[PDB]
Amino acid sequence: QDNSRYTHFLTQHYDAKPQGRDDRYCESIMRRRGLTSPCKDINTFIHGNKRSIKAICENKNGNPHRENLRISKSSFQVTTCKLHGGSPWPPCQYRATAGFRNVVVACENGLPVHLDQSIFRRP
């Protein structure tokens, strides 16, 4: 009842109710969640109900996806922070992109423990 990989998932990818989701929101939340030594190149946060995110692991809000993933049926408010400049070391400058769409995760014993970042890269 806690599973370290799940709570770590929340730490790296969940923010219940953010305010303004601008560049500065990124720079501050990344630092606050310890994702800046080195600077993560890209990281997305999901906003909203924790309950709904957990339900992606049952069929109630999830569908199998690719080899071993699950994709949500419902859409979520998300914010993607993309590292700016060319250095893995702080100060880490981030550019924010707010979005709204379904998300892809990996589950374990009923809980999300991985977020697939590829669907958020806009190459």
Swiss-Prot record:
Phenotype for residue 46 to V: In ALS9; uncertain significance; reduced ribonucleolytic activity; moderate reduction of thermal stability
Record-level GO BP terms: actin filament polymerization; angiogenesis; antibacterial humoral response; antimicrobial humoral immune response mediated by antimicrobial peptide; cell communication; cell migration; defense response to Gram-positive bacterium; hematopoietic stem cell proliferation
GO molecular function: actin binding; copper ion binding; DNA binding; endonuclease activity; heparin binding; peptide binding; protein homodimerization activity; receptor ligand activity
Outcome (variant: residue 5 to A): Affects substrate preference. Significantly decreases binding affinity for RNH1
Outcome when changing residue 117 to A/G: Strongly increased ribonuclease activity
Effect on the protein upon substituting residue 103 to I: In ALS9; uncertain significance
GO CC annotation terms, alphabetical: actin cytoskeleton; angiogenin-PRI complex; basement membrane; chromosome; cytoplasm; cytoplasmic stress granule; cytosol; endocytic vesicle
Effect upon mutating residue 17 to E: In ALS9; reduced ribonucleolytic activity
Activity regulation behaviour: Has weak tRNA ribonuclease activity by itself due to partial autoinhibition by its C-terminus (residues 140-147), which folds into a short alpha-helix that partially occludes the substrate-binding site. In absence of stress, the ribonuclease activity is inhibited by RNH1 in the cytoplasm. In response to stress, dissociates from RNH1 in the cytoplasm and associates with cytoplasmic ribosomes with vacant A-sites: ribosomes directly activate the tRNA ribonuclease activity of ANG by refolding the C-terminal alpha-helix.
Mutation effect (residue 40 to Q): Significantly decreases binding affinity for RNH1
Consequence recorded when altering residue 12 to L: In ALS9; reduced ribonucleolytic activity; low angiogenic activity; reduced mitogenic activity; wild type far-UV CD spectra
Result of altering residue 13 to R: Found in a patient with Parkinson disease; uncertain significance
UniProt: tRNA binding residues: 21-22, 81, 103
Coarse class of the protein's main subcellular location: secreted
Alphabetized UniProt keyword annotations: Amyotrophic lateral sclerosis, Angiogenesis, Cytoplasm, Developmental protein, Differentiation, Disease variant, Disulfide bond, DNA-binding, Endonuclease, Hydrolase, Neurodegeneration, Nuclease, Nucleus, Protein synthesis inhibitor, Pyrrolidone carboxylic acid, Secreted, Signal, Stress response
Result when mutating residue 100 to I: In ALS9; uncertain significance
Cellular localisation: Secreted; Nucleus; Nucleus, Nucleolus; Cytoplasm, Stress granule
Cysteine-cysteine disulfides: 26-81, 39-92, 57-107
Documented effect of changing residue 13 to A: Abolished ribonuclease activity. does not affect binding to PLXNB2 receptor
Effect of residue 66 to A: Abolished binding to PLXNB2 receptor
Mutation effect (residue 22 to G): In ALS9; homodimerization is similar to wild-type; localization in the nucleus is similar to the wild-type; strongly reduces ribonucleolytic activity
Effect annotated for changing residue 40 to E: In ALS9; uncertain significance
Mutagenesis or variant effect for residue 80 to D: Slightly increased ribonuclease activity
Pyrrolidone carboxylic acid: residues bearing it: 1
Function: Secreted ribonuclease that can either promote or restrict cell proliferation of target cells, depending on the context. Endocytosed in target cells via its receptor PLXNB2 and translocates to the cytoplasm or nucleus. Under stress conditions, localizes to the cytoplasm and promotes the assembly of stress granules (SGs): specifically cleaves a subset of tRNAs within anticodon loops to produce tRNA-derived stress-induced fragments (tiRNAs), resulting in translation repression and inhibition of cell proliferation. tiRNas also prevent formation of apoptosome, thereby promoting cell survival.
Name used for this protein in its record: Angiogenin
Source organism of the structure: Homo sapiens
Designated gene of the protein: ANG
Whole sequence portion shown: 25 to 147 of 147
